[PDB]
Subunit: 132 residues, 4 copies
């Protein structure tokens, strides 16, 4: 429960069963992750502008209750794991106390088309957010 990102469900994101399609959640996770990084003073667009990337190597999502058009969801994200070459975010998607789904995204760090260590200045800033 470090940062919270509010997301208003979009009509286009609902499926035939009348709920947010399960593939949409990864996008919600990305939005929250991006917001987290920005709030930490590491706006992601500026990171990639330096030739630094945090590509997703693994995704995991458990859907407990659905989100629907007309609702607003809150995505809580924190940096659960941080190493010199990788990061792991964990998320909780809820609506007014009710957990809707929970998941995580494992990332590697890419600098100039190659897996590498997270540059110092970015590592330093992220470290403050990671509990050692």
């Amino acid at each position: 429960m470090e940062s919270v990102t509010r997301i208003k469900v979009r009509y286009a994101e609902t499926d035939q069963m009348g709920v947010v399609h399960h593939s949409v959640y990864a996008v919600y996770l990305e939005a929250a992750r991006v917001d987290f990084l920005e709030r930490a003073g590491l706006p992601y667009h500026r990171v990639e502008a330096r030739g630094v990337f945090f590509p997703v190597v693994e995704l995991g999502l458990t859907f407990r209750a659905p989100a629907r058009f007309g609702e607003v969801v809150e995505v809580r994200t924190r940096l659960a794991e941080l190493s010199s070459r990788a990061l792991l975010f964990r998320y909780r998607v809820e609506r007014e106390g009710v957990l809707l789904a929970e998941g995580f995204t494992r990332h590697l760090c890419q600098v100039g088309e190659r897996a590498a260590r997270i540059p110092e200045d970015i590592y330093r800033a992220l470290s403050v957010l990671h509990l050692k």
Copy 2:
């Protein structure tokens, strides 16, 4: 000169009304357009590879009948307009003789900076378009 691209509707593409969301149609037109260029011997991934791009500058769609999950749609595409700087594609989205939607897409050419359509590419496109 018209080409047909068949697309099986994906579950993810339908909305609450139980039909293919209207925003998805543009993606259908894209796959059809890419299919059209590929058949013409102009695989778009290769066109961009050489630094040439056909950005969309105008989109238009009229929805007559919905498409539903479990169906296969057919997209007929043809190059309606061609110039040394722009292109206009028109389409018909149908399902077994029924017209679901019609529209178009106008494009410009970039090499990012605007530019005329490169010769070799223009010659090919030209064979697909007639005044």
Copy 3:
């Protein structure tokens, strides 16, 4: 009334050319439209729940300049035309006063599972905010 919807571009919405894919704009116009209906005292989820629908019969977009990840865009929406059985919305997608795209969406009104006239109460409400 003119609603203004601030949209933060998502990484998932940008394509290979490093810009927001043209197909995404329709989703933007839809979100802005929803906002507009909300401010019009007609939250769409509640309208739909009533069995009333506003399906899109026509869409039109002109793209003048790209939007990119890291940017926030504003979509100004106006109810351009209103008839007993239809409505036409017009939009402007801008970034810092710079017009990136403009378009419209034409809708019909479906009651239950049939194309019909816009319910009086909803029509009246729309005939005052514009």
Copy 4:
């Protein structure tokens, strides 16, 4: 068991020039719908009978990217089957190279509540499990 060939769409590519990780779930869904089709269970027909296979969990591991211009193949099999749940495992490949692997876990919904997979449907599935 099942093999679904999918042509990467331009709209599916991201700034890094590869297919966005969120698209993969959509690929798994088409491959899954295909697998059901091949088992004599066209999904649209299933839902029409008031039977659904909502996703309760998803997992994906990305080894190599997919790019526009390429065609990928999703191999899917029914790894787990019970009277109330299903577990599909997938492999996304290109020219024999593994791009990603994952799974989707499902519950069965008849009408509006979790329920046992109907007899005929379970039967057709157990044969492929």
